[PDB]
Amino acid sequence: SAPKIWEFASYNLLSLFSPGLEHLHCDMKRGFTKARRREPQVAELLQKDNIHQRIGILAQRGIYEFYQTSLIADGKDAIAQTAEILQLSQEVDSVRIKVLQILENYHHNQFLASKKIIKLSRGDEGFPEPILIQQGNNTFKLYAAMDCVLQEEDGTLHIVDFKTGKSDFDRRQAYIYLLAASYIYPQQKAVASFYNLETCQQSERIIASSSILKSFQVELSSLSQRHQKDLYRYRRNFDDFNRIFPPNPGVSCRYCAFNSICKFAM
Ligand code: SF4
């Protein structure tokens, strides 16, 4: 007889509240994405996939497949083999050439080759299993998908977050991964870093004391409650939508799935 826990937090949720990408932040976008997502006219705009999402999904799959085929060399062209597995010829050509650049970069810098792989996601999986956290009088689910976990010589776990595109690294995501690792890999030292598969730019190695992670857990617990309160307030009175999820029209609208239905779209 375990009650369902509705409260949850994740980097994705956090980013929809607190955004280098602050200019496109819009709370009304989150209102559509989370509070109105079942409305037919909203659901149909959410069922369309993005090019950057596409490049990212294929990039993760591409690293996974390149690595897999490289374990026991077969003498073949691993870049061409991986491109064939990914069916890049069926993608928009912009997408193809970016994934091919990512594969060329990996071929020249096979950063997984000699390493002890704890986790390497293919990118095709769904949401991770939740981590159930009690913080004060709140219980919430933490969702954190780790693209890559390596084990270093001294036993330290290295969480690597793969980036593509022109995005800047958001170190809050690294701290989310380090918090999650304290639950997934208990009593194991961990470090986190970012690596842009396309530009080969890397962040520093990020570590977090137990105190810093505890305080981030506090912040995520607060987020989980605020989000449920936003939803409750909207469901209690739909006419409060605009006040609960205020619009920020302008630059934000250029990359918003809901411009065709939003009353404030520019
Ligand atoms: S169309 Fe513009 S104002 Fe409306 S939700 Fe999207 S970004 Fe916000």
Token duo for residue 224: 């989980």
Distance 170 CA to ligand 1 centre (A): 23
Q: What is the 3-state secondary structure (H, E, C) of the chain?
A: CCCCCCCEEEHHHHHHHCCCCHHHCCHHHHHHHHHCCCCHHHHHHHCCCCHHHHHHHHHHHHHHHHHHHHCCCCCCCHHHHHHHHCCHHHCCHHHHHHHHHHHHHHHHCCCCCCCEEEEECCCCCCCCCCEEEEECCEEEEEECCCCEEEECCCCCEEEEEEECCCCCCCHHHHHHHHHHHHHHCCCCCEEEEEEECCCCCECCCECCCHHHHHHHHHHHHHHHHHHHHHHHHHHHCHHHHHHHCCCCCCHHHHHCCCCCCCCCCC
Place of tokens 């981590």: 131
Long-range contacts from 234-237, C-beta under 8 angstroms, 24+ separation: 234/31, 234/35, 235/35
- Angstrom distance (rounded) from CA 142 to CA 260: 33
| 42 Cβ below 6 A of ligand 1 | no
- Angstrom distance (rounded) from CA 122 to CA 65: 8
- Angstrom distance (rounded) from CA 186 to CA 175: 16
Tell me the β-bridge partners of 158. 150, 191
- What Rg do the C-alpha atoms of the chain give, in angstroms? 20
Distance 229 CA to ligand 1 centre (A): 21
- CA nearest neighbour of 204 among 188, 195, 193: 193
Looking from the CA of residue 255, the nearest atom of ligand 1 is 7
7 Cβ neighbours under 8 A, 6+ residues apart: 138, 139, 140, 141, 224, 225, 227, 228
Distance 92 CA to ligand 1 centre (A): 27
Place of tokens 């007889």: 1
| 29 Cβ below 6 A of ligand 1 | yes
Q: CA 19, 23, 27, 31 torsion: positive or negative? A: negative
Per the annotation, binding residues are 26, 253, 256, 262
- Angstrom distance (rounded) from CA 266 to CA 247: 11
